[PDB]
RNA sequence: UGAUGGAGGUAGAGCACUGUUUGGACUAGGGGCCCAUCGGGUUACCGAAUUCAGAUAAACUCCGAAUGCCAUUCAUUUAU
RNA sequence: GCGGUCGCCUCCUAAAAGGUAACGGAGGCGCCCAAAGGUUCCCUCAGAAUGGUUGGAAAUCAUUCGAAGAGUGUAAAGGCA
RNA sequence: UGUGGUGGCGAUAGCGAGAAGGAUACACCUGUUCCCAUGCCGAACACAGAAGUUAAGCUUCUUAGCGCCGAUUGUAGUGAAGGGUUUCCCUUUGUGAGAGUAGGACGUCGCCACGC
C-alpha cells in the first residue's frame, strides 16, 4: 500500500532519529482495529440487529460477531446470553487500506471541521475515536435509516503519548 | 413430569433395562444401543409402549 | 501489547500431560521438540533422568529442508539407535502440540522401524 | 415451642490405619469427604473419596511440598 | 433505656462466656488512664455514666478516649415462666473486661483535673482501678 | 560499666512462681559475638537508667572483658503489678 | 512403662480471610449549605479507594501446645 | 392439658482418633439433567484504574494490575485454578 | 566452559530494581499456494522461509527494597502432685507454644547433545 512503503522509506528513520534506538527492532507499529456497535434497543426489537451487521459487513470485509451479555441485570434490563453488540478485528493489509480510506474520505465528510479530537491519550498508545454517523462512500440514504455510528480502537506497540502521536501523525490523523 | 420407564430388546423382546426421563423435554420413545443379556450382542433398545 | 512467549504454554500442556503416566522404567518416554529450524528427541527413564538414545534433526545427518522430510529421517534414526539397546514399548510425549504435521511423521516412522505403540 | 433440635448422624470419618501396619489387599486407610489427602503409590480414590491398599505392605504418610499430604504403601 | 453503643448483630444469641486473665495493653493514645484490676461484665449504661463524669469536670473539651466497647448480648426470661423452652429475648449489650484493659485515656490537661476525672469515672464502674501515665516508655517516636 | 551480670539454667521450671514473689527480674540477651544467654536482673538497677540516662540509651554489658552493647526491645508486663517481666535485650555493635 | 512414627485443629496467641469496631493523615469527589446568576468550590462525614496506630470472636483463621488416641516380629515387668 | 415435635442431610455446642444429651443455637429435604453423563482436544476468573457515539456510577470495547477477592443445578461444611 | 533440551529437592529456588550478549542454539522476524484454522481475524493454532536484530523473551552477573526460611531466650497455657475462696487465684514437679528477633538467604544436585 501507501503506508507500508511509507514505513519502509520515510516513517521509520526519522522516528529512529528522534529517540536513537540501538536496534531497528524497537520501531513501534500498528496492530489492531476493534470496531464495536453497542445497541441496547435491540433487546426491544430483534430487527435492530438485522441492519448493523449488514452495515459493518459493507464497511469492513468481515461479518462481525454477535456479542454475549456477561451479566444479568434488570436495572439495565439484561439477562445472560443477550445479543447486544458486534466486534470487528482487523489485521494485515485491510488495516492500512481502511486507514487510507479514513484519511482520504471519512474525515472530509465531517460537519463542522475542527480537527481530530486529541484527548484519547491513555499513556500507552491507545487512541479511540467515537464516530456518530453517512461518513463513508459505500453507504446510501435510501439504505441507512438509523442514527448508528462506529467505533475505532487502534492499539499500537508504543509506550508514550509522544511516540503514539508521531506514529499516527506521520501517517495522517489531522488533530486539532 | 418424570415417569419410571422400562426398555425393550427389539429382537428377543424382554424388558431388559430401566431408567428415567422427563416427558415434556422428550415426548418421544428413546433409542439407545444398549446391551442384551440373552443374546450377548449390542441391540438397539427402545421404550416399552 | 504483551505477547506470551510460546514455551510457557508448551510447558503448561506438558505438565498437564505428564501428570497422568510417565511410567518410564522399562517402557520409557519419547520426546518431541519443535523450534523454528529443528527437531529433537530423547528416550528417558525415571527417576534416573537419563536419555538412553537420542538423535537431533540436522546436527548429525540431514535429508532435505527442515520439514516432515527431516521428521521421517529422525523417526528412522531414533528407532534405529533404539532397538540395538532392546526397547519395545515406548510411550509418546505429545509435547504441548497437536497433529497437523512434523510430529505424526515421527510417530509413523517410530511405528515401522521396531517400536510398538 | 422451639424450631430447632434436629440432627444429622455421625458418619465416622478419620484414619483407620496407623503407620507401619501390615496391610492386606484393598482395605481402607483414611476416609474423607473432600480431598484432604491425595493418594500416592498403589492407592486409589473411591467414589466417596476414600483410599485403598492395593499391594500388600506398609502404610506411610508423606508430604507434597508444603500444602497437602500423601499415603503410600511399600511392600516387602 | 436507650443504648449508647449498639452493634450490627450477625447473630441474636451467644454463649455466656468464661473470662480468666489478660495483661499488657498499655497507654497508647492519651496520657492518663485507668486499669481495671478485676474481672466482670460491663454493660452499656456504665459507659454513659463514665462519659458524663469524665466530661462534667472537663472544661472547653479536652481529650477523651474510650477504649472499651460492648459487643455481646444478654437474654432473660419473663417473671413466672418455668424452666423449659428456648432462650429469652436479647436485651442489653455487654462486654467483659479482664485484669487490665485500660478503660479510658485523657491528655492535654494537667494532673489534678485528670485525677478528679478518673476518680469520678472509677466510682461509677463496678471494678477497682488505678491511675497510669505513659509511665515507662521506650517507644515515644 | 557495672550491672547485675549473672547467668541462669536451661529450664528453671516452675520455681519461677517464687521468682514472682521475692523480687527478681528474669532477663534475656542474644547478639553477635555471644549467641544467647539468660541473665538475672533486679528492678532497682534499670529504671534508674530509664529516668537518669533515658529510655533508649546505651547499655554496656560487661563480662570483665570486651563490651556488649545491648538495647531494650520489649518489656510488657502483666497488669496490676508494677514490676518487671520479659526484658528482651538486643545487642547492636559499635 | 520406655523408645519410634503419624492421624488432628482443642488451651493460649487469635492481626492473613470473613464478621464487629476506636482515634489520625490523605482526596477522587460526593460537599446538601457555597462565593454564586466566570473561575475559586468555604464548612462538615472527610464514607467507599486507601493509609496509620489500637481492639476483639461457640458456628473467624495466617499459626498452634501439654495429654490421650492408632501402631511396631522393638525393650523390661506382670497376668491375662 | 393447650401449644410444638415424630424419618433424612450439613455446621456449632463436642473437651483437637471415633462416639456423646437438653421443648440447646442455626439452615435444608420427599427433586432435577438426555445432557447439567463418558471420552478427546482447547481455555482461565471477580473486581479496580485509564480513554470510548447515542451511554446513564454501572450493556458492548481496549490496555494494565490482580492467587481467587469468582464459579461449582440445588442448604451447609469440606474440596477444586 | 558456553548453549539448548530434559529431572527430582518445601520460594533458602520467588518478586521487584540495575547491567551485558547473539559463535552454534532459541526466539522475534517474511509470508500462506500447500496439511490445517478462525463461533470474524494467518494474533494463536498448522504449514512454507532465511531479509533483519539483541529490541523483548532467553542466559550470565549485582542488589536484602518486597515475599520466604528463621536458633536461644523468656511469657501465656498444661499433665501429675498440692492449698486457701470455690466466681477464681496461688505453690512444687515435667513439659512448652504464638508475637519479637539476632541470623540465613539473589539455589543445590542429575542425564544427553552441540561447539569450546
Ligand atoms: Zn435380545
Nearest CA-CA distance, residue A140 and chain C, Å = 38
The whole-number Å distance from F76's CA to I100's C1' is 12
Query: What are the φ and ψ backbone dihedral angles of E114, each rounded to 5 degrees?
Result: -65, -40
> What is the span of the domain harbouring residue E136?
23-141
Is there a domain that residue C11 lies in?
no
| Cα dihedral E13, E15, E16, E18 sign | negative
User: Cell for D50?
Assistant: 476414600
- Ligand 1 centroid from CA B48, angstroms: 14
Query: What are the φ and ψ backbone dihedral angles of F64, each rounded to 5 degrees?
Result: 55, 30
- What span, in angstroms and rounded, lies between the C-alpha atoms of B7 and F42? 93
Under 8 Å between Cβ of D68 and D38: yes
DSSP codes of every residue in D12-30: --EE---SS--B-TT---E
Sheet with E72-76, side-by-side order of all strands: E40-42, E89-97, E72-76
Sheet with E64-66, side-by-side order of all strands: E32-33, E104-106, E64-66
Across the interface, of E35, E138, E140, the residue whose CB is closest to F79 is E35
Under 8 Å between Cβ of E132 and E102: yes
User: Cell for C5?
Assistant: 512467549
Between the alpha carbon of residue B15 and those of residues A105, B7, B19, B29, E36, the distances in Å are 76, 6, 12, 15, 83
Q: In Å, how far from its chain's centre is CA A10? A: 24
Q: What pairs with residue D45 in β-bridges?
A: D51
Chain C residues near any Cβ of chain A (below 8 Å)? 1
Q: F64: which DSSP letter? A: S
What dihedral angle (degrees, nearest 10) is formed by the CA atoms of F29, F30, F31, F33?
90
- What span, in angstroms and rounded, lies between the C-alpha atoms of C34 and C41? 10
Is there a domain that residue E4 lies in?
no
Q: Which nucleotides of H are covered by protein (CB under 7 A)?
A: 3-6, 8-12, 17-28, 31-35, 41-43, 46-47, 50-56, 58-65, 77-80
Q: List % helix, strand, coil for chain C (3-state, nearest 5).
A: 30, 10, 55
User: Cell for E111?
Assistant: 494532673
Nearest to A43 by CA among A71, A85, A86: A85
Under 8 Å between Cβ of B45 and B8: yes
Between the alpha carbon of residue C22 and those of residues A104, C41, C90, D49, the distances in Å are 62, 16, 10, 24
Q: In Å, how far from its chain's centre is CA C32? A: 3
Under 8 Å between Cβ of D57 and D74: yes
Q: How many structural domains does chain E have?
A: 1
Is there a domain that residue E14 lies in?
no
User: Cell for A138?
Assistant: 459505500
Residues 6+ apart with CB under 8 A from E131: E32, E33, E34, E115, E118
Q: Which residue shows C-alpha cell 537431533?
A: C56
User: Cell for A83?
Assistant: 445479543
Q: Which residue shows C-alpha cell 450490627?
A: E8
Q: In Å, how far from its chain's centre is CA F48? A: 14
Under 8 Å between Cβ of C43 and C52: yes
Under 8 Å between Cβ of E68 and E40: no
F to C contact (≥3 Cβ pairs closer than 8 Å):
no
- What span, in angstroms and rounded, lies between the C-alpha atoms of E41 and E47? 12
What dihedral angle (degrees, nearest 10) is formed by the CA atoms of C70, C72, C74, C78?
180
Residues of chain E contacting residue D4, judged by C-beta atoms under 8 Å apart: 86
E72-76 and E89-97 as β-strands: parallel, antiparallel, unpaired? Answer: antiparallel
Is there a domain that residue E106 lies in?
yes
Residues of chain A contacting residue C1, judged by C-beta atoms under 8 Å apart: 31, 155, 157
User: Cell for C89?
Assistant: 514399548
Between the alpha carbon of residue B37 and those of residues A94, B41, E69, the distances in Å are 64, 8, 75
F52 CB within 8 Å of a chain E CB:
no
Q: Which residue shows C-alpha cell 551480670?
A: F5
Helices (H), D1-76: none
What dihedral angle (degrees, nearest 10) is formed by the CA atoms of E24, E30, E36, E41?
-100
> What is the span of the domain harbouring residue B48?
1-49
F to B contact (≥3 Cβ pairs closer than 8 Å):
no
> What domains sit in chain D, N to C, each tagged with a CATH number?
14-74 (2.40.50.100)
Helices (H), F1-94: 16-21, 47-52
User: Cell for E120?
Assistant: 469520678
- What span, in angstroms and rounded, lies between the C-alpha atoms of E93 and E4? 10
Between the alpha carbon of residue F74 and those of residues A95, D60, E140, F49, F52, the distances in Å are 68, 44, 13, 16, 19
Q: C20: which DSSP letter? A: T
Number of H helices, E strands in chain C: 3, 2
Q: In Å, how far from its chain's centre is CA C43? A: 8
Across the interface, of E99, E138, E140, the residue whose CB is closest to F79 is E99
Is there a domain that residue C115 lies in?
yes
3-state secondary structure of B36: strand
Is there a domain that residue C92 lies in?
yes
User: Cell for C35?
Assistant: 523450534
Is there a domain that residue E17 lies in?
no
User: Cell for C70?
Assistant: 527431516
Nearest to E23 by CA among C16, F85, A143: F85
Nearest to F23 by CA among F7, F51, F45, F2: F45
Task: Kindly provide the b/e burial profile for residues A133-162, where b requires at least 16 CB atoms within 10 angstroms of the residue's own CB.
Answer: eebbeeeeeeebeeebebbbebbbbbeeee
Is there a domain that residue C101 lies in?
yes
Biggest alpha carbon distance in chain E? 61
Q: Which chains touch E (3 or more CB pairs under 8 A)?
A: D, F
Q: How many structural domains does chain C have?
A: 1
Q: Which residue shows C-alpha cell 453497542?
A: A38
Is there a domain that residue E9 lies in?
no
E139 CB contact with strand G at below 7 Å? no
Question: How many interchain CB pairs under 8 A, A with C?
Answer: 3
Q: Which residue of A has its CA nearest to C1?
A: A157
Between the alpha carbon of residue E4 and those of residues C102, E90, E102, the distances in Å are 79, 16, 20
User: Cell for E83?
Assistant: 424452666
Q: Which residue of E has its CA nearest to F85?
A: E24
Q: How many structural domains does chain B have?
A: 1
Nearest to D59 by CA among D67, D68, D69, D49: D69
Q: Which chains touch A (3 or more CB pairs under 8 A)?
A: C
Amino acid at each position: 500500500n501507501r503506508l507500508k512503503e511509507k514505513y519502509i522509506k520515510e516513517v521509520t528513520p526519522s522516528l529512529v532519529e528522534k529517540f536513537n534506538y540501538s536496534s531497528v527492532m524497537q520501531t513501534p507499529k500498528v496492530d489492531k482495529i476493534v470496531i464495536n456497535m453497542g445497541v441496547g434497543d435491540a433487546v426491544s426489537n430483534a430487527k435492530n440487529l438485522d441492519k448493523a451487521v449488514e452495515e459493518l459487513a459493507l464497511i469492513t470485509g468481515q461479518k462481525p460477531l454477535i456479542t454475549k451479555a456477561k451479566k444479568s441485570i434488570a436495572g439495565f434490563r439484561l439477562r445472560e446470553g443477550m445479543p447486544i453488540g458486534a466486534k470487528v478485528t482487523l489485521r494485515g493489509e485491510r488495516m492500512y487500506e481502511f486507514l487510507d480510506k479514513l484519511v482520504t474520505v471519512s474525515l472530509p465528510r465531517v460537519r463542522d471541521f475542527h480537527g481530530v479530537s486529541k484527548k484519547a491519550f491513555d499513556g500507552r498508545g491507545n487512541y479511540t475515536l467515537g464516530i456518530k454517523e453517512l461518513i463513508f462512500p459505500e453507504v446510501d440514504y435510501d439504505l441507512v435509516d438509523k442514527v448508528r455510528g462506529m467505533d475505532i480502537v487502534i492499539v499500537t506497540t508504543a509506550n508514550t503519548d509522544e511516540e503514539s502521536r508521531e506514529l499516527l501523525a506521520q501517517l495522517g490523523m489531522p488533530f486539532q | 413430569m418424570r415417569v419410571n420407564i422400562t426398555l425393550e430388546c427389539t429382537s428377543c423382546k424382554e424388558r431388559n433395562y430401566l431408567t428415567n426421563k422427563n416427558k415434556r423435554n422428550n415426548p418421544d420413545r428413546l433409542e439407545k444401543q444398549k446391551y442384551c443379556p440373552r443374546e450377548r450382542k449390542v441391540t438397539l433398545h427402545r421404550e416399552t409402549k | 501489547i504483551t505477547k506470551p512467549d510460546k514455551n510457557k504454554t508448551r510447558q503448561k500442556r506438558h505438565r498437564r500431560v505428564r501428570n497422568k503416566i510417565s511410567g518410564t522404567a522399562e517402557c520409557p518416554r519419547l520426546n518431541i521438540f519443535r523450534s523454528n529450524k529443528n527437531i529433537y528427541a530423547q528416550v528417558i527413564d525415571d527417576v534416573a533422568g537419563v536419555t538412553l538414545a537420542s538423535a537431533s534433526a540436522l546436527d548429525k545427518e540431514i535429508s532435505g529442508g527442515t520439514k516432515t522430510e527431516t521428521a521421517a529421517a529422525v523417526g528412522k534414526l531414533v528407532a534405529e539407535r533404539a532397538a540395538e539397546k532392546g526397547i519395545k514399548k515406548v510411550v509418546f510425549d505429545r509435547g504441548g502440540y497437536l497433529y497437523h504435521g512434523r510430529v505424526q511423521a515421527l510417530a509413523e516412522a517410530a511405528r515401522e522401524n521396531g517400536l510398538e505403540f | 415451642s422451639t424450631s430447632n433440635g434436629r440432627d444429622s448422624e455421625s458418619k465416622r470419618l478419620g484414619a483407620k490405619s496407623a503407620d507401619g501396619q501390615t496391610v492386606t489387599g484393598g482395605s481402607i486407610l483414611y476416609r474423607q469427604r473432600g480431598t484432604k489427602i491425595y493418594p500416592g503409590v498403589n492407592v486409589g480414590i473411591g467414589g466417596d473419596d476414600t483410599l485403598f491398599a492395593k499391594v500388600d505392605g506398609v502404610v506411610r504418610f508423606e508430604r507434597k511440598g508444603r500444602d497437602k499430604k500423601q499415603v503410600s504403601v511399600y511392600p516387602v | 433505656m436507650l443504648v449508647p453503643k449498639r452493634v450490627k448483630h450477625r447473630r441474636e444469641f451467644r454463649g455466656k462466656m468464661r473470662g480468666e486473665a489478660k495483661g499488657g495493653k498499655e497507654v497508647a493514645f492519651g496520657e492518663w488512664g485507668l486499669q481495671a484490676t478485676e474481672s466482670h461484665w460491663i454493660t452499656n449504661r456504665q459507659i454513659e455514666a463514665a462519659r458524663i463524669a469524665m466530661t462534667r469536670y472537663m472544661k472547653r473539651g479536652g481529650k477523651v478516649w474510650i477504649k472499651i466497647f460492648p459487643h455481646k448480648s444478654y437474654t432473660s426470661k419473663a417473671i413466672g415462666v418455668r424452666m423449659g423452652k428456648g432462650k429469652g429475648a436479647p436485651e442489653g449489650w455487654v462486654s467483659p473486661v479482664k485484669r487490665g484493659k485500660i478503660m479510658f485515656e485523657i491528655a492535654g490537661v494537667p494532673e489534678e483535673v485528670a485525677r478528679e476525672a478518673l476518680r469520678l469515672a472509677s466510682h461509677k464502674l463496678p471494678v477497682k482501678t488505678k491511675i497510669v501515665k505513659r509511665e515507662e516508655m521506650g517507644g515515644e517516636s | 560499666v557495672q550491672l547485675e551480670v549473672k547467668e541462669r539454667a536451661i529450664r528453671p521450671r516452675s520455681l519461677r512462681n517464687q521468682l514472682r514473689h521475692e523480687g527478681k527480674v528474669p532477663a534475656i540477651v542474644y547478639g553477635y559475638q555471644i549467641e544467647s544467654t539468660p541473665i538475672y536482673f533486679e528492678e532497682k538497677d534499670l529504671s534508674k537508667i530509664l529516668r537518669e540516662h533515658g529510655a533508649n540509651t546505651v547499655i554496656k554489658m560487661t563480662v570483665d572483658g570486651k563490651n556488649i552493647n545491648t538495647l531494650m526491645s520489649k518489656a510488657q508486663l502483666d497488669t496490676f503489678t508494677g514490676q518487671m517481666l520479659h526484658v528482651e535485650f538486643l545487642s547492636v555493635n559499635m
